Amino acid sequence: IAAIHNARRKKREAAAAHKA
Amino acid sequence: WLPHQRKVFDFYASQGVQYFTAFLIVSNFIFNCAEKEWDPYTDQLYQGLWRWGEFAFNTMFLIELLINFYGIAFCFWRYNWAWNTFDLVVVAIGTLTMAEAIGGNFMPPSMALIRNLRAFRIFRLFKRIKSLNKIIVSLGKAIPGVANAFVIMVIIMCIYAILGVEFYHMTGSDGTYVTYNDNVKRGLCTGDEVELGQCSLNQTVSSETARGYTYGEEYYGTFFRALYTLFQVLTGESWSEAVARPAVFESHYDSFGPVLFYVSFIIICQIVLINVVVAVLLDKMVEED
Amino acid sequence: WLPHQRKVFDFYASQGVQYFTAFLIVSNFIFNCAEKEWDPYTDQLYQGLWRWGEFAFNTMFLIELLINFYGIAFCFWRYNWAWNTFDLVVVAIGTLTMAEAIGGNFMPPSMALIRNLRAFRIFRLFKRIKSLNKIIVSLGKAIPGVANAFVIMVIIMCIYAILGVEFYHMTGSDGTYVTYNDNVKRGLCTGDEVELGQCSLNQTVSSETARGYTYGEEYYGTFFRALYTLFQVLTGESWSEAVARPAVFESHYDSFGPVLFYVSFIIICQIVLINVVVAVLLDKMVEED
Amino acid sequence: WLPHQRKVFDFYASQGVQYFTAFLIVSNFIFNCAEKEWDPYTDQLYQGLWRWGEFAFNTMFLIELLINFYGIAFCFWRYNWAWNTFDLVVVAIGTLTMAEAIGGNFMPPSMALIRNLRAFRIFRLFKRIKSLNKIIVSLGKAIPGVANAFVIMVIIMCIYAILGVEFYHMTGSDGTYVTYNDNVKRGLCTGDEVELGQCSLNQTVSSETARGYTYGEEYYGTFFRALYTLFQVLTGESWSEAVARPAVFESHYDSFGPVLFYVSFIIICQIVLINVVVAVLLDKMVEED
Amino acid sequence: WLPHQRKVFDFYASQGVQYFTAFLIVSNFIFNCAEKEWDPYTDQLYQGLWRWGEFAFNTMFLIELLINFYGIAFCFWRYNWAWNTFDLVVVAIGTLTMAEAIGGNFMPPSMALIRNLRAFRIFRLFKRIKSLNKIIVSLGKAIPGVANAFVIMVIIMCIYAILGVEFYHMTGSDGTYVTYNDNVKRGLCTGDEVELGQCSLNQTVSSETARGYTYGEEYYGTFFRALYTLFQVLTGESWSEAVARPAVFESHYDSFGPVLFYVSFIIICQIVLINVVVAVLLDKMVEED
Ligand SMILES: CC(C)CCC[C@@H](C)[C@H]1CC[C@H]2[C@@H]3CC=C4C[C@@H](O)CC[C@]4(C)[C@H]3CC[C@]12C
Ligand SMILES: CC(C)CCC[C@@H](C)[C@H]1CC[C@H]2[C@@H]3CC=C4C[C@@H](O)CC[C@]4(C)[C@H]3CC[C@]12C
Ligand SMILES: CC(C)CCC[C@@H](C)[C@H]1CC[C@H]2[C@@H]3CC=C4C[C@@H](O)CC[C@]4(C)[C@H]3CC[C@]12C
Ligand SMILES: CC(C)CCC[C@@H](C)[C@H]1CC[C@H]2[C@@H]3CC=C4C[C@@H](O)CC[C@]4(C)[C@H]3CC[C@]12C
Ligand SMILES: CC(C)CCC[C@@H](C)[C@H]1CC[C@H]2[C@@H]3CC=C4C[C@@H](O)CC[C@]4(C)[C@H]3CC[C@]12C
Ligand SMILES: CC(C)CCC[C@@H](C)[C@H]1CC[C@H]2[C@@H]3CC=C4C[C@@H](O)CC[C@]4(C)[C@H]3CC[C@]12C
Ligand SMILES: CC(C)CCC[C@@H](C)[C@H]1CC[C@H]2[C@@H]3CC=C4C[C@@H](O)CC[C@]4(C)[C@H]3CC[C@]12C
Ligand SMILES: CC(C)CCC[C@@H](C)[C@H]1CC[C@H]2[C@@H]3CC=C4C[C@@H](O)CC[C@]4(C)[C@H]3CC[C@]12C
Ligand SMILES: CC(C)CCC[C@@H](C)[C@H]1CC[C@H]2[C@@H]3CC=C4C[C@@H](O)CC[C@]4(C)[C@H]3CC[C@]12C
Ligand SMILES: CC(C)CCC[C@@H](C)[C@H]1CC[C@H]2[C@@H]3CC=C4C[C@@H](O)CC[C@]4(C)[C@H]3CC[C@]12C
Ligand SMILES: CC(C)CCC[C@@H](C)[C@H]1CC[C@H]2[C@@H]3CC=C4C[C@@H](O)CC[C@]4(C)[C@H]3CC[C@]12C
Ligand SMILES: CC(C)CCC[C@@H](C)[C@H]1CC[C@H]2[C@@H]3CC=C4C[C@@H](O)CC[C@]4(C)[C@H]3CC[C@]12C
Ligand SMILES: [Ca+2]
Ligand SMILES: [Ca+2]
Ligand SMILES: [Ca+2]
Ligand SMILES: [Ca+2]
């Protein structure tokens, strides 16, 4: 789930950087 | 619309009334938990206590269900249908319970699993509290995304169950199986004493499980047995000591067969597929967030 | 304000003093670990060693607690209240320990679990080191988010515990249960030898656990037993070989009952709910980051 | 191009035809699952049922493979090569099965694992349904990223297997090993009764496993045995009670050896490396998303 | 600078030379794996094979280390120090191995664990292949971030080990312990037959483990035993059936003590701290990405 949570987070900042 | 229906309606929708109903729900749940804790026996010690507390809780649930329905003109089709029919079903079974408590065995002894539905009244609390509601709604809107990876998981487990019934359904059927030593090459014996009859290069091991079966009949005897066994392996439970290793070492030299069976299954299903299923689940939840 | 209080105050807040106190905390913790490693016996071999090292550490903790309090005018209400009362409690129990070491059994033998509180002085180190402080503060500000999914988890486990006490609290009560073969259809026997009395299609299996109980009394005998059992199943510990499979194969043809009980519980609680709980935990931590 | 080929081609590519083929695929899979569920025996009670249902399904698969090939001029090199050769292989083995059902043992008894390939026809469904296709394509384009961390994992497991064969391949070879008490220091006995011969500070423990071997031989007898054992430890299966603890307590005072072996392996491989492998897997999948 | 050094230097840095050295590294690793697979015995069957293949591989490693070192001017301080001293150490032990193979027992029998270092030459491959290098560098730059949460984990495990030695180091010291029935209330007996001496409400259960120890000594006998036991529980290995449940049911009515011990540990150390440690690990790796 830590592996899963980071994979999700990985996409979250990728979307955050896309908007930023 | 009935004459005094509007005020009963917005009164049942009061925060204080809903919190009191939540208190009643939680206290009924705790009453059932406490019944199982302090009187789980068949010959109960305080039977009237549970019986009449059940009666009282079912009465209050009936009463405030009627108060619920008077505000919607007893229709419950238009406003909040799903929760209303859940309440209707649970209080219908509760009134059935009041009838069992009062006036005879009008329910047949085949339908007690409907008498066990009291534990599920606590789900009405997930309607009262907005946080639990927010979590269960996220779960429910995420399950359909899990669906695809879940069915892939099930197909692969079913393939493995077919193969497992084909290969291992008769392993140890005699009740015993044979394993093979390297006692000579390991210095534990000489070739002369092996040829003489003093020691041996094979050992007869019993195949009976803790449930009275033999290995193959109990783990892969049928397709649903093998499917259950593979669900156990997916979780990772005693998958080697009870399941994999008897098959692995029953094979004298063909040990790569069972080894690769279990290793490939564990890798693919457990690691890859379980983690993809849970990843899809949590992704749909966090964009439910 | 006392006359020479300002300088004692900012001296106790010195980096070097706090690092020396951290050294003392860690060395006391190591002294306790070493006591358990090299003298865990009831008849200790070096009892004076542990007793007087305890005395010395408690003395130094008392002394620098007084140095702590002199800087805040002995009030400790205004400045850093939580840590200060934690220190006050631990050194109060330490002075109680000095009193036990010097002058008699003024503590009753019912309160030794307060004598065991020495292990928790190491938590004061989490105040000295900013990294451990940064991690425990993140943990603490994340727990309230876990709360909701945790209570949903507990409600579902409690439902399953109620059902488990209802279904399985009497499984194997005779001490044994019966399982059923397919020996004829599997070629291991003929119908003639089954009807003759030479082999059988059922086996009597003992239900006693390693703790002396029977299966039902030990896993679902009461509500808290069943709740403990479901926590164990929630972690995956021996959930099939010791818990699920005896119930599954005790059912002659109704095996879908226990199978679906355990499979549904494992799926829902263990996969979905544990992963949602941990996901919420880690999300709140990483935006604590 | 054959005269009436275009229309047969775009007719085989019809949504309704592909859904009917998917229905046939799923129903064949269910027929095989049901064969294993209701007739897994060697002496099958209903052999003609499975035999002729197999014949009928193989016939329909042959027929609509020919309908498939007539639309591509029987070439199947240019259009959709991979799926087409998968279909060709599965229906070739199915026609081989029809030949076995009709006219003799033209297949040798060494190649039954090709007769087991029927379970894998369900993979053709992953072509019909776009969701399963989308998931398996993501899996396949993610595996090459897993490759590197996987080979690092395998190298480390292989190092540990070499060391495990060196250290533990002869542990308990006598069939028994010795463990050591602290009975005197624990008050359970006096030094006088130890020197007298009434109690002892060592116990002889049997080293034989459930599969008939001794502890060293079964787990680390050879390199592939040790590699299998380390895969089992990598999954957490009984790694302490069956594997680690006998080695840990067989060492009188050198217990740090096996303890550090297993603790370092668990930490590095299990925690760090498995989580990195799965993290790479899921990252490549979610940017396959 | 030596006269013909430049060209030897950039020749050793050739892609083809480094790939040939990688082939040699991998083939030496495979030679060692194959030695453990096909000749793990003490009385080896092909001893000259392994001895002289070892000699040949060590010779080639010495030769191309000298070719390496020619390039760095035997300085190896300035260019690529870490890998160069790793190579120097491994080939120094390999030349020590050549000396053991040729001319006597100049190494004492206490230092064979240095003769086991051949398995670690494969780590030089992580220098040749850029992918394994990128993964191990990410691991190494992530470990220092793990450090803090790891030490918090260790502190909490050490607290629990201290408490476990205090509470459970003497559980079952007699070799047996007592558990308690509800046979009367469960209908399995009457109060009259309990008072008569025909049945009983307690059972004497043996406390001896598979390793010859009693339960308390084996798990919580000392601090490092308890720390090992808590590492095993952290993983989830047999933590209930072998560890938790004997303590839980040894307590007649105080079962909340051990239950809360193990449940809190699992909830704290295994559901929360392991996932934070792995989350920090993977975060530092993915921003190493
Ligand atoms: C509505 C909620 C609070 C129900 C739970 C609290 C009350 C109603 C329940 C929970 C625990 C129950 C008690 C548990 C067991 C005992 C001890 C026994 O010697 C007599 C009955 C008695 C005393 C029960 C009385 C009813 C009880 C007190
Ligand atoms: C996470 C997902 C992939 C796991 C899916 C596993 C499910 C689908 C499998 C695993 C074990 C299976 C069960 C095994 C045994 C039985 C008893 C049988 O008389 C009816 C079906 C039933 C109840 C099966 C239904 C399907 C089943 C529950
Ligand atoms: C990552 C895991 C699941 C994959 C492991 C692949 C390895 C172990 C598999 C792939 C092909 C297999 C080989 C193919 C079949 C044979 C021939 C047989 O007479 C001896 C074993 C042997 C030589 C197998 C050994 C195991 C094997 C090499
Ligand atoms: C750094 C300090 C504060 C932490 C603990 C270190 C010292 C004080 C502790 C730790 C280990 C302890 C030793 C462990 C066991 C022995 C061997 C025994 O034959 C005599 C006592 C003696 C020698 C103890 C003396 C005190 C001791 C040395
Ligand atoms: C996240 C999950 C594990 C939460 C559920 C676990 C907790 C809530 C459950 C699981 C096991 C339960 C315990 C089982 C047994 C006892 C002994 C009883 O005399 C008092 C309560 C107590 C101590 C229970 C308290 C609640 C309990 C700790
Ligand atoms: C995970 C899920 C989907 C697995 C399947 C669960 C349900 C749908 C399946 C699994 C096993 C099935 C049961 C098998 C046994 C019986 C008893 C029989 O007299 C009537 C059908 C009935 C009652 C079936 C009802 C449906 C059933 C309970
Ligand atoms: C949808 C189809 C293609 C998949 C399988 C369904 C049908 C064809 C299969 C599945 C279950 C099978 C049945 C399972 C077992 C029995 C009971 C036995 O006394 C006679 C044969 C009979 C009645 C089988 C007939 C064929 C059968 C009904
Ligand atoms: C997730 C990854 C890192 C796990 C990799 C484990 C794989 C590579 C290991 C673990 C167990 C190993 C197997 C152990 C036993 C045998 C039998 C032998 O006759 C052929 C090889 C074979 C079949 C091995 C192949 C490689 C193997 C499958
Ligand atoms: C990374 C750390 C925390 C893991 C533990 C490593 C420590 C405990 C290991 C590594 C080397 C080990 C020591 C090496 C030397 C010896 C041999 C003998 O004279 C007694 C044990 C003793 C003294 C070992 C005790 C444990 C030991 C110190
Ligand atoms: C690629 C190389 C360097 C790695 C190992 C390959 C070769 C050299 C190794 C690996 C397996 C080894 C063989 C394994 C076992 C046998 C069978 C035995 O009856 C004679 C020795 C013999 C034939 C060994 C010869 C050397 C061997 C062939
Ligand atoms: C959170 C992660 C890092 C788990 C950490 C657990 C580590 C630090 C613990 C768990 C088990 C412990 C070991 C238990 C037993 C021994 C034998 C003793 O003679 C020396 C120390 C040694 C070798 C301990 C060292 C520390 C240890 C390895
Ligand atoms: C947060 C969850 C885990 C709560 C469960 C743990 C605590 C709160 C509960 C669980 C079991 C409870 C204990 C059950 C048994 C006893 C012994 C009795 O003489 C006094 C009450 C006392 C001491 C209870 C105190 C509270 C208790 C310890
Ligand atoms: Ca049997
Ligand atoms: Ca009993
Ligand atoms: Ca043997
Ligand atoms: Ca003992």
Residue numbers in the entry:
A (entry chain E): 2 to 21
B (entry chain C), C (entry chain D), D (entry chain A), E (entry chain B): 69 to 357
Question: What did the study's authors say about this model?
Answer:
Voltage-gated sodium (NaV) channels are responsible for the initiation and propagation of electrical signals in nerves, muscles, cardiomyocytes, and other excitable cells. Inactivation of the NaV channel terminates sodium influx and thus determines the availability of the channel. Interestingly, we have recently described an unexpected N-terminal helix (N-helix) mediated N-type fast inactivation of NaVEh from the coccolithophore Emiliania huxleyi, which is mechanistically distinct from the IFM-motif mediated fast inactivation but similar to the ball-and-chain inactivation of potassium channels. Prolonged depolarization or repetitive depolarizing pulses over a duration of tens of seconds cause slow inactivation of NaV channel, a phenomenon that is significantly different from the fast inactivation in the context of onset and recovery rate.
To assess the potential Ca2+-dependent activation, we measured NaVEhWT currents in the presence of Ca2+ or EGTA using the whole-cell patch clamp recording of HEK293 cells. The NaVEh-expressing cells consistently generated robust inward currents regardless of with Ca2+ or EGTA. To further assess the potential regulation of NaVEh by Ca2+ from a structural aspect, we determined the cryo-EM structures of NaVEh in the presence of 2 mM Ca2+ (NaVEhWT_Ca) and 2 mM EGTA (NaVEhWT_EGTA), respectively. The resulting two structures are essentially identical with a root mean square deviation (RMSD) of 0.37 Å, and only subtle conformational shifts between the side-chains in the extracellular loops (ECLs) of the structures can be observed. These results confirm that Ca2+ has negligible effects on the function and structure of NaVEh. Within the SF of NaVEhWT, four E305 residues are properly orientated to form a ‘high-field strength’ (HFS) site that attracts extracellular hydrated Na+. In the presence of the N-helix, the channel activates in response to depolarizing pulses, then the N-helix quickly blocks the open activation gate, resulting in the fast inactivation of NaVEh.
